[PDB]
Design an enzyme around this catalytic site. Structure first.
Site, short mmCIF file in Angstrom:
data_model
loop_
_atom_site.label_atom_id
_atom_site.label_comp_id
_atom_site.label_asym_id
_atom_site.label_seq_id
_atom_site.Cartn_x
_atom_site.Cartn_y
_atom_site.Cartn_z
N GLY C 145 0.82 -1.21 0.00
CA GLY C 145 0.00 0.00 0.00
C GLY C 145 0.86 1.26 0.00
N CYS C 146 0.24 2.40 -0.31
CA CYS C 146 0.97 3.65 -0.49
C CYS C 146 1.44 4.23 0.84
CB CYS C 146 0.14 4.66 -1.28
SG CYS C 146 -1.49 4.99 -0.59
N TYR C 147 0.59 4.23 1.84
CA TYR C 147 1.05 4.77 3.15
C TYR C 147 2.16 3.87 3.76
CZ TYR C 147 -2.82 8.23 3.67
OH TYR C 147 -3.72 9.28 3.57
N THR C 149 4.41 2.06 2.21
CA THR C 149 5.66 2.30 1.49
C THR C 149 6.41 3.49 2.08
OG1 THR C 149 4.77 1.31 -0.55
CG2 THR C 149 6.64 2.66 -0.80
N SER C 150 5.71 4.60 2.27
CA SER C 150 6.30 5.83 2.88
C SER C 150 6.77 5.64 4.31
CB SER C 150 5.34 7.04 2.80
OG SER C 150 4.28 6.99 3.71
#
EC number: 1.2.1.38
Lengths: 340, 336, 340, 335
Positions: C145-147, C149-150
Site C-alpha cells: 500500500g501507499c502509506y 511504502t512511505s
C-alpha cells in the site's frame, strides 16, 4: 414581522447558501426546510458548517402553505413547476429554470417538459437590475441562471443605448465547478477536474436561449449569442468575457456604464484598463465589470465577474425576496467579499 | 459607535478586520494606516474590500484623537514601540508583543527586550479562557493562529485532568495565508505539502504558557507545522496519553463548551474539515482513541484569518467595550 | 525477450500509470488490457491522455495465460485472489492487499474475506528496498500500500539498527485525493474536497496491520502504530510524519540513514534541517526523507514523501517486475520528478 | 551523444530542459549556468532535479569549448547579444530575440533595436510548419507558448482556405507558470482574471505565422486569462466559415495524420488541459455555432513542454538529424 421563508432542496449548495443568507437576514427567518434524501435529519448533521439545528422535513404542501410567506425551490428541472400548483398564499422564488422563460415553448424545447397552464401564472425573470418594477408585484419569480446574470449585467447599458452591434455577440465564459450545478458523476471528481481546464457544452447550452431572451428584450432586436463555457479548477466564481462590435469610443461606453450603474449597489464599473478577478466577489452579491477596446477591429471587450452561488444564485434570490416584500433591496446582503 | 482604527490595514488580517468591522452593528472604522500603500483608498489596492477610506501614514496624535480602540498588525516589536506613544486608546495587537506573561520568553524567541512590561496592563486575548481579565485589560495580546486551535482543542482535557499533560504531540496543518518571498509563490506552493520549522516554532512557548495555566502542571509540546496548498484554515491533530474513556472525555468536552457560541464539539466518530470554518469565527473539535496505546487524538479546525486572527480580535473588542461577545461575529461559515 | 505485461483493471488511476510506465519501458510491452466498466472501448476513448488505441478486453484467463508473462491486477478486495487460482505460468503483481499479509487471518480480520489455500502460495511483500532478495524468485507479489511504502522506508534504518524505541510509533500522514481512486462518491467530488483538509479513518485503517507486520519483522519486536491519515486538496503525493522516542543523537541517526540508503537509487536522505515537499516526487519513483529531534522529550521526527501513484503504487509494481525478471531495477524508472 | 548547455537553468523552462535532456538517449548536459544561483549545486536549489552539478557563471569560452548546442533562457535581448560572440554552436533561444522575421516588429514590441539581424540564419521553431527550414538553421527562435497553441489550432483551416481569415478571435487561458505580489499563492488561488487584454507581445508573432499559412492577411483579437493551476494552455478560437464542421474535421485529420504530437479529437469531444500534462502532445477539438456560421477551435498544450522546453528539444532533434520524437516519446501524466 419577520418574513417566513421555506427552502425546498435545502441540502444542495444553493440551499446551503440560502440558509447562510437567511439566518443573517434581519427581516426574515427560516420556518421550513425539506430534503428527500435527508428528511429526518438536522441540517447540521449533514453539513456541520451550516450551524443549523432545524430538522429536514419530508415535503408537504399544506405545511408549507401554513408556515411560509415565501418559498425558495432548488429542485431538478420541472419539479418546482409541479409542486408549486398545490400551494396557497405563498410567493415562489424558483432557483431552477421552470419560470425563467417568457415563452413556455422555448422552455419545452430546451428542458423537455410542457408547462401546462403557464398563461395563468404571473411570473417574472428575477434580474432586479432589469426587472425590479415587475418583481415588486410578482407572485412567482424565475431566478436567473448564473451565466445569464453575468452576461446580461455585462451588456445591458450597451444594448439599452444602442452603443454596440447586437446581432452577433461572442461569450467566452469561465466558471468554477459549483457553477455547472448538481453533478456527482466521475467527471466532477476532484482528481479529474483539479489542475485542468476544459470547454464543455460548447454552443449548445440551456443558458443560451435564456440570455438571448433578455438581451433581445433590451435591444429590441434578435440577438444570436455564440457561447462557450469552460470549467475552471476552483470552486466558485464566473468570469464572462464578452466580444461585440462597436463604432463608439471606449470613453463614451465607459461613461454610459457609469451612468447606468451609479445607483445600483451591487454592480461596480471598474476604471478603464482594470480587469476583474473572480475572487473579488467571493461570498458576496457584488458584480465587477471591466472593459477594453481592440482598436484595429473595433471590438469591445466586456468582462464581468460574479460569485455564481451568490449573485448567480442564492444572493439574487434573497434580493428578489426583498423586492417582493418591499424591503430595502440590500437587506441581508450588506456584506463585503471575503478575501483572500 | 466604537471608533476603531487599524494599523496595517493592507495585510490579510487587516482586510478581515475591515470586513468584520464594516458589518459590526456597534462599531465603525475611523482610522486606517498602511506603510506600503498610504495615500490610496483601500479599495484601489483591494477592490474586494469595497472601502473608499484613503489609507493614512501612521500618526499617533490622529489615532489618539479619532480612535477608542486600535488594532495593530505590524512587524514584531513595532506595536510595543508605537503603543508607548499612545494614551487613552485600548489596544488589541495581532502580533506577539503582548502575548507572553514573562517578557523574558518573548525576548528569547523574538529577540527584543520589552522594557517596562510589568507596568503594562496586558492579557492573552483567548476569550474562552480569559474573558474576565480581558474585560478590564487596556492592552490585549491577540493569540496566534496555531495556539488558538491547540489550546481550544486541549482545554477541557487539561482543566479536568483527563490526560497526561506531561508530553503532548501536536501535528498541525495550515493553509498558506497562515504560514511574499519566492517560496510563497503560486507555482511553488501549489499541489504540494511540506513540513516547516519543525520543533522550533515561536508558537510553542506560547502554547506551553497557556496550556500549563489550564493544567496546573508543566506541559511540553512537540509541534510540527505543515504548509497546505489552500488559502486558509488550520487543522491541529493532537496526541496525548490518557487513562479515561473516550465517552468520558467527550462528555467533558460538551460540558466545557456548552455555553460557548464559537466552539462546537462534534459527535463521536465525526472529524472536522477545515472548510467547515470558512470565513467565520467558529471552531470544530473532534476526537478518537487508539485503544491499544491509550492515545487520545484530538482534532480542531479553525479559519486562521478569523478565529485564528481578526475575528478573535473583534471578539476581544466586544469584551473590552461590554458588548455581547458575538456582536459582528454571528454569521455562519460559507460553504462549499 | 520483451516482457509481456497484462493489466487487469486498466481504467483505474493505477492502471493508467502502469500504461504510461510500460509504454516507455524499453524491455516490456503491453499485451493485455481488461476492464469491468469499459470493456469493448479503446482506452483512449475513456482517457485520451493515455494515447492508447487498444480495445479494453473482458477478462479471460485463457487469453491472459496465452499472451502474458506477467499480470498486474487492480481489482476490489478478494478479486485478485480468486482469479489467481485459475491461472498458470504467469507471474502476478497485485496492487491490492490479497497477497500482502504473511498471516491470512490478519487479512481476513481487516478485509473480511477468507483466503483458503494461502499457505501453498509462494507470495512476497513487494517492497524492494527490504525484500528484493525474495522478490527475485517470487511468483506472486503483493505490491505494498501507499502509506506503508512511505512509512517503512522512513523507519527502516532506525529499526534495523536499533536506533529508536519501536514499541509505540505515531504516524500522522497526509495524502492527495488520488489515494481514493476514480470512485464516484460525493465526498470525492471536486467541490467537497477543494480548499479543505480533513482527517479520516482515524486509528482504524487497513494499512495499519500491514505497517505493523513489516515494522515488527525488521525491529524483531512488536510494533503498535498510531496512524491518522488526512486528505489534502491536491491530486498526488504522500507526506508521512513519524514520531518515535530515541536515546540517540540526531547526528548519529542521520549518519545511519545516509549509510543505509547510500546505494538505493530511489531513496534520498535530505540534508539535516531540510524537510521534504511532496511535489519533489511528482510523477517519479523517488522518495525523500528528512528528520528533526525534539530534544526535551527525546522525540525523533521522521518525514517521508512519495508520489502515491508511482512509488506508492504502479512504479513500485514495475520495480518489482524488473526484479522478478532479472532486469536492471531502475529500467523504465530512470526519469526525474517533474517540477513545478 | 550531443553536448547540450543550458543558460538560465534555474527558471522553470530550464528545469524542464534538465529533466528532458537527462532522459534523452542521444544528448547530455555539459554546461549549466544561472545568473542567480551560480556557485550552488542545482539540487541545493531544486531538490527535485536530482542534479548535483554546480551552476556555472556564464563563460562563453567554456561554452564554445563544451557544447554542440545551447538553449538560452535569459531576459529579452540578452542573446542575441552573446549569440553573435559565439561560433560553431547551434542556438535554440527560448525567448523572443529570433522569432521575428521583421526585427522592426521586435523593436516596437520588445523595445530593442536588433542590429545585424538580416545576416543571421534564424528560423521560427515550430516543427509542424517549418522543420525543413529548421533542419539547416544555426539559430532557432523557439516559439512563445500561446502562439504554439494558436497556430496549431488554425493551420489546417488556414492552409485549406476553410475559414474567413480576415478576423480571428482568440480567448486564451493559462496556468500561472505560463514573480511579484500578484503571483503569490494566496493572491492567485481560487481566482481567475484576464490580463494584458488586447495588448500582448505574442499577437504580432501569431499574425506573422497565420498570414503565411493562409496566404492572406490575418487580424487576431487575443485575450489571455490567468487560471489557478500550475500549467496548461487552452486556446478557444472563433472564426467565421462557410464550410461544414464535418469537412473541417476531415481536413484536420488529414493535415495532422503524420504528426506525432498533434491529436485531433473526435467530433463533440473538447480537450482538457491536463490531458497534455508533462508531455509534448497537443489536443484539438472543435464545434460549430450553426446560426452564425462560427467555428470554435480549441487547442490544449502543456505550456512548459510543447509550449516551451519540449518544443525546444524537438527543434534540437531536427537540427541534428534525429527522429523528431527522440527524448519525447513519453505520454501525459494523468491524473
Amino acid at each position: 414581522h419577520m418574513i417566513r421563508a421555506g427552502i425546498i432542496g435545502a441540502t444542495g449548495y444553493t440551499g446551503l447558501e440560502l440558509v447562510r443568507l437567511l439566518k443573517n437576514h434581519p427581516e426574515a427567518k427560516i420556518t421550513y426546510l425539506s430534503s428527500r434524501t435527508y428528511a429526518g435529519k438536522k441540517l447540521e448533521e449533514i453539513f456541520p458548517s451550516t450551524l443549523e439545528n432545524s430538522i429536514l422535513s419530508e415535503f408537504d404542501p399544506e405545511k408549507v402553505s401554513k408556515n411560509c410567506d415565501v418559498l425558495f425551490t432548488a429542485l431538478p428541472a420541472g419539479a418546482s413547476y409541479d409542486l408549486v400548483r398545490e400551494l396557497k398564499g405563498v410567493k415562489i422564488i424558483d432557483l431552477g429554470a421552470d419560470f425563467r422563460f417568457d415563452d413556455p415553448g422555448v422552455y419545452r424545447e430546451w428542458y423537455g417538459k410542457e408547462l401546462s397552464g403557464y398563461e395563468n401564472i404571473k411570473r417574472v425573470y428575477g434580474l432586479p437590475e432589469l426587472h425590479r418594477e415587475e418583481i415588486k408585484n410578482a407572485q412567482v419569480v424565475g431566478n436567473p441562471g448564473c451565466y445569464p446574470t453575468s452576461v446580461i449585467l455585462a451588456l445591458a447599458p450597451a444594448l439599452k443605448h444602442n452603443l454596440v452591434d447586437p446581432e452577433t455577440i461572442l461569450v467566452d465564459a469561465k466558471s468554477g465547478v459549483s457553477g455547472a450545478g448538481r453533478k456527482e458523476k466521475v467527471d466532477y471528481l476532484f482528481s479529474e477536474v483539479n489542475e485542468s481546464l476544459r470547454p464543455y457544452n460548447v454552443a449548445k447550452h440551456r443558458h443560451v436561449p435564456e440570455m438571448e431572451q433578455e438581451l433581445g428584450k433590451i435591444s429590441g432586436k434578435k440577438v444570436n449569442v455564440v457561447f462557450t463555457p469552460h470549467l475552471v479548477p476552483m470552486t466558485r466564481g464566473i468570469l464572462s468575457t464578452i466580444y461585440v462590435k462597436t463604432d463608439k469610443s471606449l470613453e463614451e461606453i465607459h461613461e454610459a456604464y457609469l451612468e447606468f450603474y451609479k445607483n445600483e449597489p451591487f454592480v461596480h464599473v471598474l476604471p478603464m484598463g482594470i480587469y476583474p478577478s473572480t475572487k473579488w466577489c467571493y461570498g458576496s452579491n457584488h458584480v465587477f465589470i471591466g472593459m477594453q477596446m481592440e482598436e484595429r477591429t473595433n471590438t469591445l471587450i466586456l468582462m464581468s465577474a460574479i460569485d455564481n452561488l451568490v449573485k448567480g444564485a442564492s444572493g439574487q434570490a434573497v434580493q428578489n425576496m426583498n423586492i417582493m416584500f418591499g424591503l430595502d433591496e440590500t437587506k441581508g446582503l450588506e456584506f463585503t467579499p471575503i478575501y483572500p
